[PDB]
With several copies, the nearest count.
Chain A
């Protein structure tokens, strides 16, 4: 899906509160999505193995 305009994620200056919050938000998002990606890949690969073995046993 498309995403066009977002917050800034790199900073060349020292601003404090808002910078801290933006970094926290992006980091939280990244960690949650990485967790989701690892879990989805693990689950889908387990399902692939299971379906192949099930087809062998079916035959």
Chain B
């Protein structure tokens, strides 16, 4: 998921529309990843990321 985080693909950041409904075994987050949609934050970000992963 090179320019996208798992949460961005989850919410549906427009650059992440490729990951719609896709499955996986290991998600690779890049250091170049960045969000481009509406600014947001997630209370318990790590927990949602972990459970989605």
CB of A21 to closest CB in B, whole Å: 14
A-B contact count (CB 8 A): 3
The dominant DSSP class at the B interface is helix
Q: Does A5 contact B (CB under 8 A)?
A: yes
Q: How many residues of B contact A (CB 8 A)?
A: 3
Cβ contact within 8 Å between B53 and A5: yes
CB of B52 to closest CB in A, whole Å: 12
CB of B28 to closest CB in A, whole Å: 15
Mask, B33-53, CB within 8 Å of A = 1, is 000000000000010001001
Binding site for B on A (CB under 8 A): 5, 8
Between-chain CB contacts (< 8 Å), 3 pairs = A5-B50, A5-B53, A8-B46
Question: Which 3 pairs across A and B sit closest by C-beta, in order of nearness?
Answer: A8-B46, A5-B53, A5-B50
